[PDB]
Amino acid sequence: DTKEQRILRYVQQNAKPGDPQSVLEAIDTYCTQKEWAMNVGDAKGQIMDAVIREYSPSLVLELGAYCGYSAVRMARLLQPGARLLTMEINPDCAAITQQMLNFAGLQDKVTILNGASQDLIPQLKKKYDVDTLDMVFLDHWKDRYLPDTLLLEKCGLLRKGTVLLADNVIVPGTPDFLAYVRGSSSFECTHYSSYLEYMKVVDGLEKAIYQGP
Ligand SMILES: O=C(NC/C=C/[C@H]1O[C@@H](n2cnc(C(F)(F)F)c2)[C@H](O)[C@@H]1O)c1cc([N+](=O)[O-])cc(O)c1O
Numbered sequence: 001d002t003k004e005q006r007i008l009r010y011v012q013q014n015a016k017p018g019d020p021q022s023v024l025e026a027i028d029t030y031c032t033q034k035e036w037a038m039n040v041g042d043a044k045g046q047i048m049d050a051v052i053r054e055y056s057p058s059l060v061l062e063l064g065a066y067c068g069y070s071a072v073r074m075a076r077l078l079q080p081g082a083r084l085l086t087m088e089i090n091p092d093c094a095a096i097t098q099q100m101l102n103f104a105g106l107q108d109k110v111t112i113l114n115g116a117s118q119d120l121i122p123q124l125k126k127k128y129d130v131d132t133l134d135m136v137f138l139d140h141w142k143d144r145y146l147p148d149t150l151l152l153e154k155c156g157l158l159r160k161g162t163v164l165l166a167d168n169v170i171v172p173g174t175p176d177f178l179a180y181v182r183g184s185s186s187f188e189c190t191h192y193s194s195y196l197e198y199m200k201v202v203d204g205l206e207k208a209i210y211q212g213p
């Protein structure tokens with residue numbers, strides 16, 4: 001029994017089927033109160049929602065599905081016919097994410113790709129009927145943000161105006177990626193400051209009164 005399975009089961013038991021907002025709220029409650037997990041969380045999530053709404057992307061790529069929190073967050077805001085592709089190298093995570101999406105009623109909008117980016121990015125256009133991406137959400141291993149961006153470019157998946165949106169550029173940090181995009185004339189960058197997810201961390205003092213030998 002893993003933390004991720006506990007999160008899914010919590011959702012199935014507490015959230016309302018076919019209600020994405022309910023699913024997000026259940027995940028957030030569980031991770032706030034019971035076990036920290038690396039979901040983007042509500043604070044950063046509200047910023048994501050505002051960016052998605054602004055750009056109204058027809059085709060989004062997510063790198064890093066985890067438990068499907070951001071996939072639910074993004075897919076619930078997609079217009080009819082728009083698609084989210086989400087890449088997850090861990091097959092246990094990919095299965096949890098599919099179940100989370102199913103529970104939320106968002107399965108028709110989302111395609112889970114189970115594999116490594118080095119294999120899957122070059123197969124996107126041919127296997128998943130993609131021309132160029134409107135938006136990319138980066139939230140996988142932090143050392144993979146830059147090499148994957150470069151691979152996306154190599155493969156012709158970026159067009160003028162493709163929006164990349166990257167989580168965790170402060171904590172844990174993505175320093176090569178951040179320096180690269182901020183220094184490149186090929187990118188125009190904006191920073192949205194917020195807070196790391198679920199950081200009300202409990203600690204305590206123990207008092208121990210000696211009673212003698
Ligand atoms: O390490 C963090 N995230 C790593 C998240 C990694 C997730 O992305 C998947 N993946 C890996 N490669 C691919 C692909 F697509 F390329 F194939 C998909 C991994 O299996 C995992 O589910 C993290 C850590 C903290 N923190 O505070 O420690 C806070 C956060 O918000 C975080 O995102």
Ligand SMILES: [Mg+2]
Binds near residue numbers: 038039040139167168
């Ligand atoms: Mg993250």
